[PDB]
Amino acid sequence: HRVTLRKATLASLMQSLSGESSNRVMWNDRYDTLLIARDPREIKNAIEKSVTDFGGLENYKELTGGADPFALMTPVCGLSANNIFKLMTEKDVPIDPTSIEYLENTSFAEHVNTLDSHKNYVVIVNDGRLGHKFLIDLPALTQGPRTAYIIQSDLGGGALPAVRVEDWISRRGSDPVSLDELNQLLSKDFSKMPDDVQTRLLASILQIDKDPHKVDIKKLHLDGKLRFASHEYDFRQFQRNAQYVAGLG
């Protein structure tokens, strides 16, 4: 019942992000250091320092769009995928998902077929057609089929509507996705597939209500590239990292 536990880990993790310390430790863009080595006091001091550099908070808003740099964040796609990837895969050696090796000319089916049946993997996807970054979680399930789940956030603006990571995880975080559809989505040929096929693959895999009327294929960059990278993880280490972060610490 790894699936049931996974669901609970993800749920308590997401609920804790209303907490200042949890939020800042989760959503930070330093990737060369261990996620769990992040100090929420120091992060807060770094923001204070930056705001001072800018001549105070009301000035800081003027020159950077109006954002209160102390506010808690809900992350854009690259930031959610990069950090949840580190959360899942790290133990005591830092991993920088921005620097790992990506595969550009491999089909997803080809790649998954090479993965150890007894290992958990997470795949980070950098999708140029969509302009989107997201994760595919492939936990090993005992006497069960190879099963895939999506983890993502999206501020919107492309083919897909906006979705917060918290909402995504709450509605679809334990919803298995077709490796078949994923293989089709992730192929080179995806750019040439009919409107209705593209719209339905997208809605089915990436839209929170699986609603094809919520998908705008006119925003696709049909010449965009697809790259992806996979990495094993220890399930208990994942739980352990998330518990720590949720510990409002």
Residue numbers in the entry: 14 to 262
What do the study's own words say?
One family of T3S effectors, the Cifs, re-program the host cell cycle causing arrest at the G2/M or the G1/S transition. The structures reveal a head-and-tail domain arrangement, with the head-domain adopting an overall fold similar to papain-like cysteine proteases. The structure of the tail-domain of CifPl and CifBp presents an extensive surface area adjacent to the active site suggestive of a binding surface for interaction with a specific substrate.
Limited protelysis of CifBp with trypsin identified a stable fragment with a molecular weight of ∼30 kDa, as determined from SDS-PAGE gels (not shown). Although it is expected that Cif proteins function as monomers in vivo, each of the Cifs produced in this study displays the properties of monomer-dimer equilibria in solution, with the exception of CifBp which purifies as a single species (whose apparent molecular weight suggests a dimeric form). The two chains of CifBp overlay with an rmsd of 0.42 Å (245 equivalent Cα atoms) and can therefore be considered essentially identical. The structure of CifBp determined here is virtually identical to that recently determined independently. The structure of CifPl overlays on CifBp with rmsds of 1.24 Å (chain A, 226 equivalent Cα atoms) and 1.25 Å (chain B, 226 equivalent Cα atoms). CifPl and CifBp overlay on the structure of CifEc (chain A) with an rmsd of 1.33 Å and 1.20 Å respectively (145 and 151 equivalent Cα atoms). The structures presented here show that the conformation of the occluding loop is conserved in both CifPl (residues 203–212) and CifBp (residues 168–177).
